Structure 1
Amino acid sequence: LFDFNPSSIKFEKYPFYYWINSSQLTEFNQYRKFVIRDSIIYSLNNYII
């Protein structure tokens, strides 16, 4: 009520923006079979250029 409160504003227009794939910023400690997902994400992000 009476202190700092984190904002909830986000990117709500770019497609598949929050389908974050593995990189050095995520340390590759995810589910093993998510590599396929990464490929899909990659392909999707090449479709919207």
Structure 2
Amino acid sequence: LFDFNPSSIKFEKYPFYYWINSSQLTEFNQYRKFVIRDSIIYSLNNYII
């Protein structure tokens, strides 16, 4: 209530924006069977674009 408070602003419009598929930035220490999740995220991004 007196010091720096991080903002809560976020993207509210772009679909599936926060479904972050694994890459170099996020490393590859995720759950092993998230390869299908990454593939589905890639397909959804392709469909959007």
TM-score tier, shorter chain, comes to over 0.9
Higher helix share: 2
Question: Runs of 4 or more off by more than 3 Å in structure 1?
Answer: none
* Identity across matched positions, percent: 100
Q: What is the RMSD computed on CA atoms of the aligned residues? A: 0.3
2:27 match: 27
Tell me the TM-score normalised to structure 2 length. Answer: 0.98
Tell me the TM-score normalised to structure 1 length. Answer: 0.98
Deviation at 1:10, TM superposition (A): 0.3
Deviation at 1:23, TM superposition (A): 0.4
For structure 2, the 5+ residue unaligned runs are: none
SS in 2 for 1:36: helix
